[PDB]
């Protein structure tokens, strides 16, 4: 294994950023 293991770590980091933006906008929406 090499960058593949990092791709899954990368995947959750990006996926959580998608969820943090929605959580942030949910409380700060218009």
Swiss-Prot record:
It is a multi-pass membrane protein. It comes from Hepatitis C virus genotype 1a (isolate H77) (HCV). It is found in: Host endoplasmic reticulum membrane. Palmitoylated. This modification may play a role in its polymerization or in protein-protein interactions. Homomultimer. Interacts with non-structural protein NS5A. Interacts with host PLA2G4C; this interaction likely initiates the recruitment of replication complexes to lipid droplets. Interacts with host STING; this interaction disrupts the interaction between STING and TBK1 thereby suppressing the interferon signaling. Interacts with host METTL22; this interaction may promote the recruitment of NS4B in the proximity of lipid droplet. Part of the replication complex composed of NS2, NS3, NS4A, NS4B, NS5A and the RNA-directed RNA polymerase embedded in an ER-derived membranous web. This is Non-structural protein 4B. Contains a glycine zipper region that critically contributes to the biogenesis of functional ER-derived replication organelles. Induces a specific membrane alteration that serves as a scaffold for the virus replication complex. This membrane alteration gives rise to the so-called ER-derived membranous web that contains the replication complex. NS4B self-interaction contributes to its function in membranous web formation. Promotes host TRIF protein degradation in a CASP8-dependent manner thereby inhibiting host TLR3-mediated interferon signaling. Disrupts the interaction between STING and TBK1 contributing to the inhibition of interferon signaling. The chain holds residues 1751 to 1780 of 3011 of the full protein. It comes from the Viruses.
């Amino acid at each position: 294994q090499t960058n593949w293991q990092k791709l899954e770590v990368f995947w959750a980091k990006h996926m959580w950023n998608f969820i943090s933006g929605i959580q942030y906008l949910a409380g700060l929406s218009t």
